[PDB]
Amino acid sequence: MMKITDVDVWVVNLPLVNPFTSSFETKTGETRTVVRVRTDSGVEGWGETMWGAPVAAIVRRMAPDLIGTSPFALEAFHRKQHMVPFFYGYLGYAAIAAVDVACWDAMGKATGQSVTDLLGGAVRDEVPITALITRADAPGATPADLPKAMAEHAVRVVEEGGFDAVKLKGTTDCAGDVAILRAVREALPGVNLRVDPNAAWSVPDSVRAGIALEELDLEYLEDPCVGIEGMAQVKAKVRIPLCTNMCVVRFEDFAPAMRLNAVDVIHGDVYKWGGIAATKALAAHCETFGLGMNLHSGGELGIATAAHLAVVSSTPVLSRAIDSMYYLHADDIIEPLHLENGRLRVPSGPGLGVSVDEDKLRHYAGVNERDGDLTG
Amino acid sequence: MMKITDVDVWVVNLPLVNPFTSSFETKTGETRTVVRVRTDSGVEGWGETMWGAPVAAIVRRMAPDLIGTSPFALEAFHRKQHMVPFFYGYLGYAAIAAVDVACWDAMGKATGQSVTDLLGGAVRDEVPITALITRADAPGATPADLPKAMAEHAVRVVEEGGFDAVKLKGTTDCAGDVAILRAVREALPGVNLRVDPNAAWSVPDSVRAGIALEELDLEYLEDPCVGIEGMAQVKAKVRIPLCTNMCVVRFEDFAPAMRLNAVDVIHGDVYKWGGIAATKALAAHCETFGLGMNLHSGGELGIATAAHLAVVSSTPVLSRAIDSMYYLHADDIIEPLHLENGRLRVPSGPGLGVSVDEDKLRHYAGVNERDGDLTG
Amino acid sequence: MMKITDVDVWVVNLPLVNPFTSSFETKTGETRTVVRVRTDSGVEGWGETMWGAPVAAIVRRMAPDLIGTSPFALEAFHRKQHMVPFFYGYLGYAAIAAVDVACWDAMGKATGQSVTDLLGGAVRDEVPITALITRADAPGATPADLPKAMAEHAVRVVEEGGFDAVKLKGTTDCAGDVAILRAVREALPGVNLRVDPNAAWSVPDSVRAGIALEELDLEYLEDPCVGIEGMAQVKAKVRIPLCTNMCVVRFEDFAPAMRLNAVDVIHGDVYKWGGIAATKALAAHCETFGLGMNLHSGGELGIATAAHLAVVSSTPVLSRAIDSMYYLHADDIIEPLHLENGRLRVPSGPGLGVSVDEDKLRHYAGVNERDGDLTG
Amino acid sequence: MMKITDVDVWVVNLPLVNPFTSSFETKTGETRTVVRVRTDSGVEGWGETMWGAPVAAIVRRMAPDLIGTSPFALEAFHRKQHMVPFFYGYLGYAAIAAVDVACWDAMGKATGQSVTDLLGGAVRDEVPITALITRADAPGATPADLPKAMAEHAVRVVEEGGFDAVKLKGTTDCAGDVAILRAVREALPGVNLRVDPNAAWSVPDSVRAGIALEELDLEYLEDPCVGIEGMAQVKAKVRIPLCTNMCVVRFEDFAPAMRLNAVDVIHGDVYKWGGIAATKALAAHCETFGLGMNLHSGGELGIATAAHLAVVSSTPVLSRAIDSMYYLHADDIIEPLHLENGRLRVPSGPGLGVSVDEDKLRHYAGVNERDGDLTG
């Protein structure tokens, strides 16, 4: 009969090993929000979600009403907070997800079960991850030299890391993106290969590039352009599976995207969709419509990755190499997850199966206090 | 670390209070299949599903491979048995559901939690049920007298029982069905009213009847005709929400039914859909597509009803008066559920929250052994 | 004025020559249900259908009401049993088909006519069959060696057997399936070539594989993925005729599959569709919608094959090499059908044109009694 | 082993009792083509089809190649004559149907079975027919008086004849047609009521009239306008089941009519569709698409009506009162069918179950020879 007694929130800054360039920005660290839910039985559940001050602010506003409730009562919590994402958008889903994850952790600890086992049990014990490559990996390169430099980098990363998949972060320079992919495919004929321009290409440029890229047999083309309408126009012309984490980001988007035939693959992400049950539900929706599914990464540290691992472990349709920034981090706030030969081991043991280093938590919260958010 | 040690299966015959007439048959009892899953920790999980000998046979064939597995490992179990419904159809889903429910019961008992709490926790504590009326309730009646006799019966049942909804079992006599509904609505202007011909009407007759029935503001018209195509033609013409438990009975049916705009409301049913997680998933699918959802009854006794109650208790979209044959039964194989003023109380306590009377189980299994199945 | 006096049912186990691997299982024998319908004129009609104990059980439950009816009264029989497939699924259609076939046999014998002549008469006298190849035909092979081993096997089977068509049983390993087909096509440039993954591939993998397979000019791609929705997505992208025996398996599926443009070719199968008239009707539906048609094999012995031969003989649209496990059987329960140069001769003479060896029937029923079903 | 030895053809003129007015013409007799197929076993099969000289001419051209063939070989015959309807249109189907029917008669006689029993056996023994009313039934009437005169006529016909359905032959005067139907419905509140303008109304007038007619709950509106496009526009706006025997008259029309949602009910007619098997196939197509089905009448005498009766008797979906000019004829060329209380008794006995009066045949062929065709 657990009742929540405390909800505490921190914001942390953690460092990457090397810079990371999307079409959007170039980052050198993660800012994350960490939540601990305490109960009257002494159980402590931990959650973690994307971004800093504004996400923490939402969690702290939801907290007073969480006091005295059961961590098992997630349906009631989500319904109570139904309007939060309407106003706060992605940050609203993210804030709700932190609480959601912390409650699953607490539920597992209270019952002596892994979150994986509360989600249907394991169908796999290891989760392959994806090598993320960006133009920041070829700092010196001239436009003429960029494709070769990127391909040589990709080969090193795959050979050293054992990655099953490689994903290029695309840019506004779509012709250059295509040139890079051609060189990477030539160097790695057998690797699953993706490109993600983060919606930076126009629809006509996405069609022209997509046609050019057909010969490379990409696993998918991820968000070439903005919007359900544009994505559907691309899917109508281009014979490459089309993936999104930008035009379908909530259930309200799903029926319209299906009727308009906008996508072939959807990325789940607990922090984007507001919780673990939502992500299991999304998996079922993908199976019903014959869609592929993968997981998107928003810069998860160990707590948030452990939640995603529980989801992948227990979800048949998540059979691909997921996106994960985890291997690119220089430190964590839990004892490190097991990463070997390009796959993460699913934690075992009660809850998320992680142990939080509260000294590192305190330290990196201090770093954030002095340095400010790296996000936002 | 529960491991299953035994799977035992019985088939029972239980009596109704009065006969029950669908367009399909007239019944005076239920035949059900009961499953107990035993573990090495001493925990015993109970499930119950529809029909007799052929469903029991499927469960017994799945049983040997269940030995040594965890009741938490439901994703693996469902995937292992994925082909069973392709060959065995509804009976295959039903057999899988019995095992599924027994595992949820065992999971709750092992963790000291209600199934309701393992499904997201309660959002409601009571579940309204529906008064089911059939032509067997007006045994003596001439065609001219039938509508009045049915209306007078409906009034008595609603006034005595406190039911929020009334459902007429329709027949091949669609003109007579309409006459009955007109009389019932006149007598009960405020009750939620439904008719279910169990697909016995042709599409043109469904359109003609549907048009006639618009003036009665039915909660829904349930399966007037056969098939996604026919149902979609009815929905295109008739301004009454259209419900099914016959043209969408598995996830493979769902995408086509949406693209063809076949239905407005879908009935879930754990035993028809093969398990509890499938039913929670169906609820999410209904929310995504703006569909109503209710629960169908296939003649559940106490164990199977308790499972449905856990689902309704924890599922916002199940906000309607469900169908339930439970109130029409003359006995049960558990200590009776609480039924008061037309609503069932959600059980509390570990697992399904029921206690099985093994003497009644043994007795009614003997009744089945001597009398044979009443179903099939 | 024949009236049925007896309906007797056996279940038999019969051996294959070599193992047979689908994406689903690996088999070494068939289990079948055999039905004899006796009349008051002394005429005996024989039917045969798929699977064992559960199909036999359905037939035996339908039997008492068959007593005293005419074998000609098939419309009435099918309507009486209309609900059987709703509950019993594929097994329900199968059980009905056994009775259906036995009645056609009895009708032919009573009238001195072949079933072929009662179905519109012959338009062809020979029926080409298909060489079925599976990975079990390359037992020793490494992944690198598998395509060559499969191609060499295919060449031997085609050269020795005179087969017009070759069908690869596909697997979850879709990349390996494609490699095998490439090698087979290279070795046999002129053969009609098919692959059937039995719905084991995801939709994105089906699109990727389908694109790759276009260069091989396959006769069709059969059930790459699950469901009408997925199949329609494949047909929208992949320029290979798409065939099914899994997403359209009854008339209720047909209108939705047409509106959603899901398939180009449909497999008929008397045992899957519940009878001979249903299969003739399906042929007409295929002609109306410009679909190809072939026949699926569920492991027919001589009685069931003879029924399929009567259908093919009398049905213009069945102009392809059918699937037939018949040539892979080590024995039969009738005097063997004529198989020469990759085609089966249509039987002549009254009814199905077969003579049942009742000693073999008794023997193989005993084998089943002691060994149990190989199916289910 | 029947082989056809002779095909003989006559054209006959037979009288009606009273004139019959469609939107198209006013008739006082039928002209029909009669065919006898003789075999080497002495069996004689009889067929009958619509119209005279030009239909007889087609049959006589097909005849020489029929010599030496089996009456059972209908699939081969239809395929051989596949191009005949492309050039000769309705008359081509009609000529083929005469031969088709004669072969079914011969098949039944050769096997000692009714045609009904060769078509799946009886599901009903009686066939209700429809009272056909036209403006010729109110000869004296002023426009102001016409509706009352028509209603009084309808009442007399229904009360005297026991008809379950009444069908008004519509005209170019759509406002007058509506006025008549209003008066008829007022006088006969319980009768199934239809109107058939034989495509004489424009689409806008069909929409205006259809809207006006909704209040009368017609069984169907039959061919208000020309063409699949127009019919679909009517169905989109008007809430009355829409029936045709003019925009879907062959299988090539069926898929387009379904995709465009043109009709709710299709009339079969053996003579329009070229044979009995085609009509059974059409029934199955209607069931698959949830369409109603009825039979159209082109002026059948006893032989042709007997064929239609065999079809209705054996076909579940033909559950309506059929159209039949039979009751309006002053004589026949067989011993009269049993008509009592508005329903025709299905013949029993071998073949079509009719006995041809060859003296009447000879007489009415002479009448045609001297008087000429009344059709064409």
Short mmCIF file of C-alpha atoms in Angstrom, two decimals, chain C residues 1 70 72-76 79 104 107 110-111 113 116-123 251-252 254-261 280-281 284-289 314-317, chain D residues 1 70 72-76 79 104 107 110-111 113 116-123 251-252 254-261 280-281 284-289 314-317:
data_model
loop_
_atom_site.label_atom_id
_atom_site.label_comp_id
_atom_site.label_asym_id
_atom_site.label_seq_id
_atom_site.Cartn_x
_atom_site.Cartn_y
_atom_site.Cartn_z
CA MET C 1 -33.78 -40.18 -53.53
CA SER C 70 -29.78 -35.88 -49.22
CA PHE C 72 -27.49 -33.14 -52.96
CA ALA C 73 -28.72 -30.73 -50.25
CA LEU C 74 -25.41 -28.91 -49.83
CA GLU C 75 -26.82 -25.37 -49.81
CA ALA C 76 -28.96 -26.32 -46.81
CA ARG C 79 -26.39 -22.62 -44.20
CA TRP C 104 -19.90 -34.49 -54.16
CA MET C 107 -23.55 -37.24 -55.97
CA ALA C 110 -25.37 -41.72 -57.70
CA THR C 111 -25.58 -40.02 -61.11
CA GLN C 113 -20.94 -38.78 -63.51
CA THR C 116 -15.54 -32.80 -62.93
CA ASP C 117 -18.64 -33.15 -65.10
CA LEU C 118 -20.92 -31.91 -62.30
CA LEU C 119 -18.70 -28.80 -62.07
CA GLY C 120 -19.00 -27.71 -65.71
CA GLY C 121 -16.95 -30.38 -67.41
CA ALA C 122 -13.27 -30.52 -68.31
CA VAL C 123 -11.37 -27.68 -69.97
CA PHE C 251 -15.41 -14.33 -48.52
CA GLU C 252 -15.68 -11.79 -45.68
CA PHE C 254 -12.57 -10.39 -50.18
CA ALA C 255 -14.35 -7.03 -50.47
CA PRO C 256 -12.00 -5.32 -48.02
CA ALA C 257 -8.95 -6.80 -49.80
CA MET C 258 -10.23 -5.45 -53.11
CA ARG C 259 -11.03 -1.97 -51.85
CA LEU C 260 -7.59 -1.76 -50.24
CA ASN C 261 -5.86 -3.27 -53.31
CA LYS C 280 -15.77 -22.44 -57.93
CA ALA C 281 -17.31 -19.22 -56.60
CA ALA C 284 -15.49 -16.43 -60.51
CA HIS C 285 -14.66 -13.66 -58.03
CA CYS C 286 -11.04 -13.74 -59.20
CA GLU C 287 -12.09 -13.44 -62.85
CA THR C 288 -14.40 -10.50 -62.02
CA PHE C 289 -11.57 -8.59 -60.32
CA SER C 314 -13.26 -27.64 -64.81
CA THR C 315 -12.04 -24.13 -64.00
CA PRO C 316 -10.43 -21.97 -66.74
CA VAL C 317 -8.77 -19.47 -64.37
CA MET D 1 -21.69 -40.46 -72.24
CA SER D 70 -21.54 -33.41 -74.04
CA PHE D 72 -22.13 -31.50 -69.27
CA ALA D 73 -19.32 -29.58 -71.03
CA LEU D 74 -20.70 -26.11 -70.28
CA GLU D 75 -17.42 -24.53 -69.17
CA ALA D 76 -15.94 -25.39 -72.57
CA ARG D 79 -15.29 -20.26 -73.22
CA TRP D 104 -29.00 -28.19 -67.64
CA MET D 107 -28.13 -33.03 -67.50
CA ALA D 110 -29.71 -37.90 -67.84
CA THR D 111 -28.97 -38.13 -64.10
CA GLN D 113 -32.12 -35.29 -60.80
CA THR D 116 -32.54 -27.61 -58.36
CA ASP D 117 -30.65 -30.57 -56.93
CA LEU D 118 -27.73 -30.08 -59.35
CA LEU D 119 -27.50 -26.47 -58.09
CA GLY D 120 -27.09 -27.25 -54.39
CA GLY D 121 -30.56 -28.47 -53.54
CA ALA D 122 -33.62 -26.63 -52.27
CA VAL D 123 -33.57 -24.12 -49.43
CA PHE D 251 -19.26 -9.36 -64.67
CA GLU D 252 -17.10 -6.71 -66.37
CA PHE D 254 -19.25 -5.50 -61.28
CA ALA D 255 -15.84 -4.38 -60.00
CA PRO D 256 -16.27 -0.83 -61.30
CA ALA D 257 -19.78 -0.63 -59.80
CA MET D 258 -18.42 -1.73 -56.43
CA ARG D 259 -15.48 0.66 -56.40
CA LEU D 260 -17.79 3.52 -57.33
CA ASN D 261 -20.48 2.41 -54.84
CA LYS D 280 -25.28 -18.70 -59.12
CA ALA D 281 -21.91 -16.93 -59.35
CA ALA D 284 -22.14 -15.34 -54.47
CA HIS D 285 -20.72 -11.98 -55.59
CA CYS D 286 -23.74 -10.23 -54.05
CA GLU D 287 -23.24 -12.05 -50.74
CA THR D 288 -19.53 -11.13 -50.71
CA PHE D 289 -20.30 -7.43 -51.18
CA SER D 314 -31.37 -23.33 -54.40
CA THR D 315 -30.04 -19.84 -53.67
CA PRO D 316 -30.33 -18.37 -50.12
CA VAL D 317 -29.74 -14.74 -51.15
#
